[PDB]
Scaffold this active site. Structure first.
Site: not given
Ligand SMILES: [Zn+2]
Length: 318
Positions: A56-59, A130-132, A149, A162, A183, A186, A225, A250
């Protein structure tokens, strides 16, 4: 500033013209890519390469996405990706992550095109905003990628002493069961390797940004862009002879005057001035441009077959 000497010291340590396209067109690029000189390709990709998957358009506030987050009352919008906030209040991020973890989308034609570049030994690196997780799902490997990212694929304990790693199935199960991952060694929080505000990125990011653009033969910029960090800086790092193709719906308009000047002074894209010699814009959907380019390279059927096979494999394994 008594600091100027130190800044000069570092800048001197860290400081780093032909027409190779026969024509400034997609066809010219495709011919160049078949030439001996085109050995190393870098792709820089953004959100536009994943739209056609359904991301989706996350905005927009108007889709499923954020309603679930009202109950948390964030003190500022970036706090959901800020490390000191996460350490005190991990629940909002994990509520968002439930929506963002892979499983509900398949890679696009554009992703599989990058897989062909890898298969053919042409892909030096894909830099992605991207993070998909779709580059990885398409078969690009960690070494192929600089994920600006970070990634949901890998996860680590947040404690510097750790830093135990955990696999995707361990995390995804916790996130889907709304258990905050801790974790086992720890008891610190475990988070996916999304790069938060306040966190150090993997060292390889800078090393790749400092090396890769020295001997890149072609830049493919897709679904973003040009006026987006770090990409604005990275295109101006390429050798002056290196051709650069933008595939996007565009061309962005002017966004700021310093960044704008800097671009113009620094070897930014020049598609159509009297001095244009190496940059090509192809305006349309990323899938359409990759289809077209593949067809020019003689890769139409190979790409078709790859998309079909891999999509079917995702169906079979879901
Ligand atoms: Zn840990």
């Amino acid at each position: 500033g008594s600091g100027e000497a130190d800044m000069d010291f570092l800048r001197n340590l860290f400081s780093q013209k032909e027409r190779l396209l026969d024509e400034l067109t997609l066809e010219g690029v495709a011919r160049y890519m078949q030439s001996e000189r085109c050995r190393r390709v870098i792709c820089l990709v953004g959100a536009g390469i994943s739209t056609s998957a359904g991301i989706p358009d996350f905005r927009s506030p108007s889709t499923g996405l954020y309603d679930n987050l009202e109950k948390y009352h964030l003190p500022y919008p970036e706090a959901i990706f800020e490390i000191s906030y996460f350490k005190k209040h991990p629940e909002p991020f994990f509520a968002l992550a439930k929506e963002l973890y892979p499983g509900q989308f398949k890679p696009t034609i554009c992703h599989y095109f990058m897989r062909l570049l890898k298969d053919k030994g042409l892909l030096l690196r894909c830099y992605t905003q991207n993070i998909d997780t779709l580059e990885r799902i398409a078969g690009l490997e960690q070494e192929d990628l600089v994920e600006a990212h970070g990634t949901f694929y890998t996860s680590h304990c947040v404690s510097a002493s750790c830093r135990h790693e955990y696999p995707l199935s361990w995390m995804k199960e916790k996130i889907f069961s709304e258990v905050t991952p801790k974790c086992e060694d720890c008891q610190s929080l475990v988070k996916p390797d999304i790069v938060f505000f306040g966190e150090s990125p993997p060292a390889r990011f800078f090393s790749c940004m400092q090396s890769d653009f020295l001997k890149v033969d072609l830049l493919l910029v897709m679904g973003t862009s040009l006026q987006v960090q770090p990409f604005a800086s990275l295109i101006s790092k390429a050798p002056l002879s290196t051709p650069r193709l933008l595939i996007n719906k565009e061309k962005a308009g002017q966004s700021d005057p310093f960044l704008g000047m800097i671009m113009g002074l620094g070897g930014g894209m020049d598609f159509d001035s009297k001095k244009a010699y190496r940059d090509v814009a192809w305006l349309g959907e990323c899938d359409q441009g990759c289809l077209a380019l593949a067809e020019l390279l003689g890769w139409k059927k190979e790409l078709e077959d790859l998309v079909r096979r891999e999509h079917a494999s995702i169906d079979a394994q879901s």
